[PDB]
Design a protein around this nucleic acid. Structure first.
Lengths: 97, 164, 131, 147
RNA sequence: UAGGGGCGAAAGACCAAUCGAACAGUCUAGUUGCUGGUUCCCUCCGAAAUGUCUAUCAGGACAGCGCGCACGCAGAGAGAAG
RNA sequence: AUACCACACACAAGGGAUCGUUUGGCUCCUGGGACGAGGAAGGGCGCAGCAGAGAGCGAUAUGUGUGGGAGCAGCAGCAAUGACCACACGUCCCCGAAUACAGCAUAGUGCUGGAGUACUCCUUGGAAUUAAGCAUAUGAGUAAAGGAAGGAAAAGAAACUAACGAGGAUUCCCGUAGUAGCGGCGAGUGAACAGGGAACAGUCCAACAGUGUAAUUCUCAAAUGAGAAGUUGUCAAAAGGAAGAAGAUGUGAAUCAGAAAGAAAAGCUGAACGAUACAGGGUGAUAGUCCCGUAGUGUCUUCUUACAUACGGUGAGUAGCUGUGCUCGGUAAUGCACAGUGAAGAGGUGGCAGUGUGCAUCUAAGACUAAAUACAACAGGAGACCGAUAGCAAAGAAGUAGGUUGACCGAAAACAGUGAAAUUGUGUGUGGACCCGAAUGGAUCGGGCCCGUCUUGAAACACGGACCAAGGAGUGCACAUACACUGCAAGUUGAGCAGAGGAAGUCUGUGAGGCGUAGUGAAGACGGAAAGCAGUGUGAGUGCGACCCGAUAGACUUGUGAACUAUA
């Protein structure tokens, strides 16, 4: 059997290359900026025209009573992900302020 | 079951199993030969195969061996002074998915491009090549070899300073 | 040796092709050699035997005989020659048929289209002979 | 021998084909495959295959062979990797050979036996045993670890 | 009105000489620890119907007794004398 | 035993074995992959000078044109004013999707329906069987039943692998591997990346179209007008070519004679001649030169293929979550669904559940794509295949004669050859069931129960066997194994695939992988004996129909039946 002869320490070694730095892409052109602005604008109009959904109302009500941990549990069960819940709570909080 | 054997494990239980024979092997070989030949006439002066880069193999087991890859990157082509549309016209393969992460790997693939450019010859029409009696190249172009090297010797004073 | 792979060398296939022949291919079966003189009078070396032509029998029972062709049986490949016959118990006489290749032509029947048939064959030769 | 007649051809004319008159030759008198092993075939298993009925060891749901594959050489064989014509040069010559085990597909060096020629050598590999290191240093050689 | 369905003044009766679950065709060469059969000559060697475990008792496997190839070799299915 | 019964031999009967022969079958390879409302596939009925079946053809039931050219198989008649054949065209009765119909689109014309389905895609979904019982599991996502398309079909340009010093669409071959794992952890099941090759190719829509004028598509007119679609958004450019391949068809060398003998010479004997042609077939026995071809050479006809504009980073009842059912090697969820619930613009993944945080790699919920790969009908070429109880069921008017109420089921028969055995008559001999040993001029003497088979034991009042011929049962592949034989040896090898070559053979490369070169532990970790690899065969184990024949049963169908009998 030609397997499992080296230790983990010696398997971790590596050859000394010379690396190339990554080309950063930070510049964003004028036309790309206007494009992003118009999309964010459109998102405002929808919220203005049609308002909040039932679970969003129930959520925001709990935030007024400082029921932070109840709101957390509630949102987790509605959206599934604990990450989506943490994000949606932060967006709702900012809307109320 | 009787006596001493390695315990059986032969998988022939399934009644829907198909068998594949290979009686066609010599004939299909002859067809592949005849297709290449006729394809070679359609583009007579030009090689049938394109030029390909040299890359390094994958795991810890094959690190020390070099191999042909799919295509040159936009950076390799540009560094050797060409443009992508021209490279295609001259029979160089292109792969825009590949990335460059080393100095060494880049330098070697630039050499291949410059070597190939130098060995080419250009013609106005097919008849000109025909009249000059040009013989078209067959097989892969500039393939790697990966031989075993040879044992170098070193003087006892060097041993302290370089370590092979 | 044969180097063309589209032509068969099977005994079974060659035999079926013979016996099931029709049309012009059937006519090719009735060919005979011409005598040495006629091969100077005309360009041709061999022709299909027809009624009224004059033939020497060169093999079999009736060897050395000469006579006029009476009939040509295409289905059972045989020719009937004047004066080649057998007598039954009754005294009645039946013409016995001879296979084309055992004959040789001595004089040609030139009735009908024969002169045009000969011309057509001579031209077909020269067309390629002179090239 | 390259060819021999079979047994079946001698059994023509003899009634039972060598299976017995009382015992006969039936279809499956003992069961199919390797079944029965805890029951009527327990004596075969306990004699020839005692470690069959068990579960054992640590589990990884996916393994990669290329990441773990290795091959081993002993110190007594190091000089043997070189060609015989090459061996016979370095034996007399004033120079020191530089042998890289990676080039022959070896990655680990073991301490078996004594070195073929008692003069210095440089050995390149990924791992050495403690015995191997001591033996190479004994002759004034050097061990170089490399990837 | 048609097959795990019909129809029955009820006998498990009848449903194309078939009914305590029809016919045709296919899966399918279904399975069988059980019965029957198993095809030329001469030469040489030659058994067992016992033990252990088995949903085991008309079956298996392991060991014991045959044969083939045989590295090698002071032994013996008998007596004496303590 | 005059005449009965038995045996031997000769002749005549009776049957169709054996040997000789074959315009048929089977297998592998290559091409082809061509139907229908312009009425198909399949069914029926008519048509000849004498004509039942089969073949061919439609009330034009042998018509027209082109290329050829000699007879029409029997009898009577026809034929250079064209017998007969080959290529195309014209004509083409009734039933059948069967339609004067149904559904559906356009400004309008229209399109679909039925047939076929070996191979490919989408659904639905068993049981026998194995586990020596059986219920999870296996057989198997197989059989069966439905929908759909093409000469191939499907797939296809990363919400991809990997942790290397990394690679880079899909499909196919060698391989990782009978491994990691799944499993009454039982029986049994079971993938992926790498490394070596064949073939290679990338692009479109939405997000996002000239506003100093819809610049766009269609119809009729006209030589410049009317009208329809469309602002719920139309409109984003090139001709062009010689190559390549497959068929059809023309031509095409060179011999005569003889004794004996035979129905017949091509045999045998002597003398010649051809060869870039001695592949094969036919001729009254075994032919290079008698006939058709073959090697070599000409012509012609079809088919295939090729240059232009404008752009990015937000595609929702979706991804995901909870419950549930099926599925996969996928294991505290691999994929697919249904109900509740339901995002963010930034999200998805890194084979073990959760929370946090850097790092690497990608961009789902819209579309298209060649080549390398698979396999019926029909056509062509080959074979260490079968030779009329064989080979396809079928070498002749074979899916026929014939049969089921129905679905469905289904034979025999070669040559006017040879002419065995069982069995029969006549003649001549020898015996009274017959075999073995030994003999006479002649009466006979001695020994023997009926074979095969299970069985402690068969001549048995145990079973099978009236007689003869022909057929009739340890085979093939995969995986480990011990032995015999062969080459090389710390190594070894016909992987696939490329190069050469009038070629399914052979020769040569490139080049993986596997096993071996030393073991110990679950593992972290450590390390210190023992010739192998690949073949040619034999004995033997396991899985597949598995030495040959044989159940009562179980399941599945968009298959059939109330002509007998039950009841309204």
């Amino acid at each position: 059997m030609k397997i499992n002869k080296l230790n983990n320490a010696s398997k971790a070694l590596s050859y000394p290359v010379k690396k190339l730095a990554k080309t950063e892409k930070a510049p964003l052109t004028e036309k790309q900026q206007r494009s992003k602005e118009l999309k964010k604008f459109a998102m405002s109009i929808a919220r203005e025209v049609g308002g909040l959904a039932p679970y969003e109302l129930r959520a925001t009500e709990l935030l007024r009573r400082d029921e932070d941990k109840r709101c957390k549990k509630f949102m987790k069960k509605r959206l599934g992900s604990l990450k989506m819940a943490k994000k949606k709570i932060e967006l709702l909080a900012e809307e109320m302020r | 079951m009787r006596g001493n054997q390695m315990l059986p494990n032969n998988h022939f239980n399934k009644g829907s199993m198909k068998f594949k024979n290979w009686f066609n092997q010599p004939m299909r070989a002859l067809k592949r030969k005849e297709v290449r030949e006729q394809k070679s006439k359609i583009c007579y002066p030009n090689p049938l195969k394109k030029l390909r880069p040299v890359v390094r193999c994958c795991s810890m087991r094959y690190n020390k061996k070099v191999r042909l890859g799919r295509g040159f990157t936009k950076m390799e082509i540009e560094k050797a002074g060409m443009d992508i549309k021209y490279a295609i016209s001259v029979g160089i393969a292109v792969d825009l998915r590949r990335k460059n992460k080393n100095e060494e790997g880049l330098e070697e693939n630039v050499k291949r491009l410059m070597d190939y450019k130098n060995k080419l010859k250009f013609f106005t029409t097919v008849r000109e090549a025909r009249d000059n009696k040009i013989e078209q190249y067959k097989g892969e172009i500039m393939k790697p070899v990966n031989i075993i090297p040879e044992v170098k010797g070193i003087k006892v004073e060097e041993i302290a300073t370089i370590y092979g | 040796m044969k180097f063309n792979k589209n032509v068969t060398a099977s005994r079974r296939k060659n035999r079926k092709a013979h016996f099931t022949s029709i049309g012009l291919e059937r006519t090719k079966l009735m060919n005979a050699p011409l005598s040495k003189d006629l091969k100077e009078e005309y360009g041709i070396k061999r022709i299909a035997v027809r009624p009224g032509d004059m033939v020497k029998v060169v093999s079999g029972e009736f060897k050395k005989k000469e006579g006029v062709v009476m009939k040509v049986n295409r289905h059972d490949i045989k020719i009937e020659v004047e004066g080649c016959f057998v007598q039954k118990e009754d005294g009645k006489k039946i013409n016995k048929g001879i296979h084309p290749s055992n004959l040789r032509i001595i004089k040609l029947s030139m009735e009908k289209d024969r002169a045009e048939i000969i011309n057509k064959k001579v031209e077909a030769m020269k067309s390629e002979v002179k090239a | 021998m390259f060819n021999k007649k079979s047994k079946s051809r001698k059994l023509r004319g003899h009634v039972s084909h060598g299976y017995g008159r009382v015992g006969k030759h039936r279809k499956h008198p003992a069961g199919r495959g390797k079944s029965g092993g805890l029951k009527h075939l327990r004596s075969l298993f306990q004699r020839y295959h005692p470690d069959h009925f068990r579960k054992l060891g640590i589990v990884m749901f996916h393994r990669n062979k290329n990441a773990d594959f290795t091959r081993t050489v002993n110190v007594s064989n190091l000089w043997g990797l070189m060609k015989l014509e090459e061996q016979m040069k370095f034996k007399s010559s004033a120079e020191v050979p530089v042998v890289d085990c990676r080039n022959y597909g070896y990655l680990k060096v073991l301490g078996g036996g004594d070195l073929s020629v008692k003069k210095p050598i440089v050995v390149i590999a990924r791992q050495f045993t403690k015995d191997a290191e001591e033996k190479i240093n004994a002759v004034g050689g050097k061990c170089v670890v490399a990837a």
